[PDB]
Write a structure and sequence with these properties.
It is built from eight helices and eight strands. It has about 230 residues and is of the alpha+beta class. It holds the Pfam family Imm52.
Length: about 230
């Protein structure tokens, strides 16, 4: 009995719809998202621009100074896509260190939000299932363009996912469709999000037919998206 250290935590957005937003809109959404993260745990209360020296990396607190967000974008944006990277000021993954990577390009691959390495949160959260669900809830409310979400152990996704050419719902995930409890295992909890879809909690924290059976059902329903 030992928890998985590395977790993947990614949410995907409809490329066409997300691309409609201008820079101010993206910045506003990230601002709202950081605000939604703040009450969930102390390590999520402060976000900073990355930097060389430790002094440089902790000088620009975007949760205190909103105008700094535009500096993240201005520095991180690519020549063909909105992009921003933030860190929470904690170096060690064992103490809740976390980085945020947001990209909006008009292509599925670069229209997403990732928290890395989410396994760091899983150990600082005193009640992780609900706290992670709260993060999904925040993304869904801020980005109606969300098309998929997955929280899963890295090792599971890479070496055990049922479908090689498909995404996975993971331990906790988002599927943009209503789902019926009768189609899923007893260990699965379905949380209905009207006007969005469903959040699935597949059994207890992976320490996995629980996730596999859910992916299988999603694939049979035609709801499990391709990787490409």
């Amino acid at each position: 009995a030992k928890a998985f250290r590395r977790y993947i935590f990614e949410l995907y957005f409809d490329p066409a719809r997300l691309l409609e937003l201008d820079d101010d809109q993206h910045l506003q959404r990230i601002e709202r998202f950081l605000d939604a993260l703040a009450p969930l745990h102390p390590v999520l209360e402060n976000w900073y621009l990355c930097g060389d020296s430790l002094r440089d990396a902790l000088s620009h607190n975007v949760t205190e100074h909103r105008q700094d967000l535009a500096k993240a974008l201005s520095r991180d944006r690519r020549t063909r896509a909105v992009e921003l990277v933030l860190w929470n000021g904690e170096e060690d993954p064992l103490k809740g260190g976390l980085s945020l990577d947001y990209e909006a390009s008009g292509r599925a691959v670069s229209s997403r939000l990732q928290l890395e390495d989410a396994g760091s949160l899983l150990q600082v959260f005193d009640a992780p299932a609900s706290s992670f669900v709260a993060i999904f809830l925040a993304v869904l409310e801020i980005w109606p363009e969300t098309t998929w979400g997955m929280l899963a152990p890295h090792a599971y996704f890479v070496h055990q996912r049922t479908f090689p050419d498909r995404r996975s719902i993971g331990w906790i995930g988002f599927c943009p469709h209503p789902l019926r409890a009768t189609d899923f295992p007893a260990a699965t909890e379905l949380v209905d999000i009207p006007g969005r879809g469903t959040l699935l909690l597949n059994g207890r924290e992976p320490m996995f037919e629980r996730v596999g059976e859910a992916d299988i059902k999603l694939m049979e329903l035609g709801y499990l998206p391709p990787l490409r």
